[PDB]
Amino acid sequence: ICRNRVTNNVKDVTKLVANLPKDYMITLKYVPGMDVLPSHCWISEMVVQLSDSLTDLLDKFSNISEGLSNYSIIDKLVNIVDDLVECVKENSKSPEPRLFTPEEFFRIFNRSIDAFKDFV
């Protein structure tokens, strides 16, 4: 039940975090206490917000053919989260914007992806 729709590219996220400045800042409408309140109360909001956020990052980078690049990785992550949006809308007010260093933002992302695989 959509655990198949996450493609395994997500393992790339750890390389992406390594290629972003530790003090760059990424902007996400953080649904409150998703670290706190249970797996299905936030997830519908969070996956759409993550879609917007990752397409914003995708604007910032430019494409290079030879090798893996931040543009490749983020392009594939936006494919993942936009298919998860399609799923959550089929299978099943805005938090104020909040700013995250790459490590923290991707922890939120990986928490969402982990939250997906055990869903009603």
Add this chain to the structure above:
Amino acid sequence: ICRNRVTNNVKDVTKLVANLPKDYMITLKYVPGMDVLPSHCWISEMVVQLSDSLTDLLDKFSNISEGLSNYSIIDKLVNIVDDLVECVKENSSPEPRLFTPEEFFRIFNRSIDAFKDFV
């Protein structure tokens, strides 16, 4: 002279720019009139500043084992600039300004180009 110090790891710069965020800011103590003047007066101060900036920028990234990474590329560039600092010092401060990666790497590439027929 000092042409031998610059190694062809500079070609990596175009990938580094492409792989850094276009809204990112990098901080350089510029040497104004850089574009207009002849090479020799600004190049001496510029390589020193570029060393400082590239080293601080180097800290921001983390190392990746499998394939090329910003920490790798910047580490090589930092080696080049510290070699050029040494040859400038052994053969021959304005306030900070903030540059997007494309702008900063233009400045860098022009500095390394100033070592082609340098005097």
Add this chain to the structure above:
Amino acid sequence: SPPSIHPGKSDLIVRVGDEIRLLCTDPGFVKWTFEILDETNENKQNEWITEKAEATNTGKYTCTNKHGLSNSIYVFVRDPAKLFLVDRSLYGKEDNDTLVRCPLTDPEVTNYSLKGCQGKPLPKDLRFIPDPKAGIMIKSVKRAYHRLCLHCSVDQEGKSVLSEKFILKVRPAFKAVPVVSVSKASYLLREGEEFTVTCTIKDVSSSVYSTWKRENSQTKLQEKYNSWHHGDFNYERQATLTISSARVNDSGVFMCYANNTFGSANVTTTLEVVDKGFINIFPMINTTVFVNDGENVDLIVEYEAFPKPEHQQWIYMNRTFTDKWEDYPKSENESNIRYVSELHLTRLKGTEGGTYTFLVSNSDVNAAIAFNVYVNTKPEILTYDRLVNGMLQCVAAGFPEPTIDWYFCFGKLVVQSSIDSSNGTVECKAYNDVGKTSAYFNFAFK
């Protein structure tokens, strides 16, 4: 009687920060209900008041009685700061209409239209219809538009004004079928080996469904998956099917199946599990072969062997033959279990007529086939005698067994004739298929 409203207009305009006030007169009045984008509010006062309008207050206001019937007014807030209202989310089924949620806060403006980001002109065949109450709508969204970047734009005081920036994303229609391929087509295994086959499915989208099922059996097998997104509208899946200790009953057909709303595709692999390995041997000629002395002969075997044969050797008279023999798999296919071996005996001598044996083994089985080679020879006469009876003998030798004639004017058979003649020439003339030899003697009276 559907309910009735004061003010009386279908559309109504208020300046920012200035009161909004709606009355609905029905004796059955229930509810007032306000919608814009996904924001909805529900209220049960007979009158709706908002003494401090804001651009967000732009929207539609709808009043309902207990008869269940409704009448509405749409309210627009002039606000020089915010001419648009947006929800950035923008998704399109390919070949469906898609709506771009940028409704306007003032209806009295011109050239409400849609414009590409960063200066780029929109695709020529993209075409759209504007509606200030909803947004702008895009007819028949097609794959080129994927991550197409859009602005909504409106003119005020002759100056041209744009919304916050929008990205269209497109969710394929299926117009073809999944493409499915399997790593090896047929498998053969010793019982107790592990069996691993991998099947690859390629489609424009991960909503392809794919399975491994065992034919004439409806139960789902246990499977592990890997997926890639290889850029836009290019998705690849790999599925791996494992039996950790293969039983003979496991033998059969496994089907890799993959359906999408256009339609299914399948590809099958076949598995044989065998309890122990075999070597079948098929001689290509008869096991008994005939050669003339100094002519040439080949001995050829083809054999089926699993597990792959480990030794193969040719022996003559219990001595191992070397450097005359060449062996090759009949086909280079991954499913070939099959081998050809040849021994070339060139310019053979009559002395090597005899027996040639081929011995081959794998880990489980040893098998041998034997060949008999008869080297034909022209006859010889090897004794001649004139004997006390007045009677004569000659002895001739060779293969096939030779024949001896008299005239007047494993290995060689042996054959003899006697005749008594009692002036001139007596001959023994000796022949078989291969050749002829003759011996003569003379006797006299005086």
Add this chain to the structure above:
Amino acid sequence: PPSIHPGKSDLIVRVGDEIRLLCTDPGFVKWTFEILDETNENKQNEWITEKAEATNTGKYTCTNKHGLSNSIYVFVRDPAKLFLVDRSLYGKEDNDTLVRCPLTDPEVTNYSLKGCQGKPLPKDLRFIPDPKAGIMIKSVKRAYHRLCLHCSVDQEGKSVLSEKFILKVRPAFKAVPVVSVSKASYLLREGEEFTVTCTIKDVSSSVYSTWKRENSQTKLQEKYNSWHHGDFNYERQATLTISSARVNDSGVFMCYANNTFGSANVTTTLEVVDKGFINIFPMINTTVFVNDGENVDLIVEYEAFPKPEHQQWIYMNRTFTDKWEDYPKSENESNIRYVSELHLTRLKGTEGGTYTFLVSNSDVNAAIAFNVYVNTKPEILTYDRMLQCVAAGFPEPTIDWYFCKLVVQSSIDSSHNGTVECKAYNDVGKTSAYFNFAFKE
């Protein structure tokens, strides 16, 4: 010499207070001030700044006609800014290195050097402080490369850290450059574009490397590629190239590499030739002698540049198939030398004659020929009856008469109870025919 009031060597002034210095000397030339890389000089014997900034910590010197000199050194106590810094720090390997974080206040304790992000300094790094200068680092090793350092002061139990200092080290050369060449030796047709690559590996790009034609100081036009591969690890590739190698361009080339420690050279030799060539040596005499049904191996071993386009073996002007075999004498990239073999098993005796080996490249064709005789114990063709015995041989039959490939005939007159035997023989053996006569009745 001069004299300066205030009298002592050192002065301490609160930030925003006046610094006033007079040098009393009638040959006075100038005050002079310097800290870090700053400088100022004044020819006014009275020097004031009314509000001392933190930066106006420094050393101030008085100087005169004598050249005699006296100095005062001055602190500006600012609780906000306890160090002056220069962020650029360089060390040469096993020289002492100085970290310019001089203090603006001298009445501080535990002035020391400490590692960034709470990491501890390596076990054998050690330092000498001076409040007037900075902190000086003994005997820099290579493991200190890109170490990060802070300067640490305690002032009224209060603890203060500088901006980051990052310490980077010029290697000192302690081993010879290391040099390698793509091939030790070359051979080319004249016309070929010779190119070779020489690889130099060292700890630093200031290694020096050249290509020299042996026995000349002339300079060869060369092009370069270089990489840094991790720290203290440099690699250079330098490639010599001539567009059309000539016979007099044939000669010997050296690749040389040098650093302050020592020197290494590696050499490659270039043969250039005007004609392509083939040379042939038989492993065995060209005449070969065989007993009929014995086995023969024929071997031709030949040196051929450029590489041979054909090998074939022909017998009596008919082309020979499936019994001839070739391999180079060596697998290596130098190899110009080849072996060819023809194998003949249990030769028939009709099968003597000449067997020839033909080899060609684009520029030469060469042929070697073998003459092969196949002996036989003579085979008596015919016995007929005067009676004749005719025998077919190599070498020539020898024919015998008893009573109790060439062809050679014997005959005898027959003119008592008898057998008469014919023996035909040579070095290979004996074949015998009996014709028998009895007189009876």
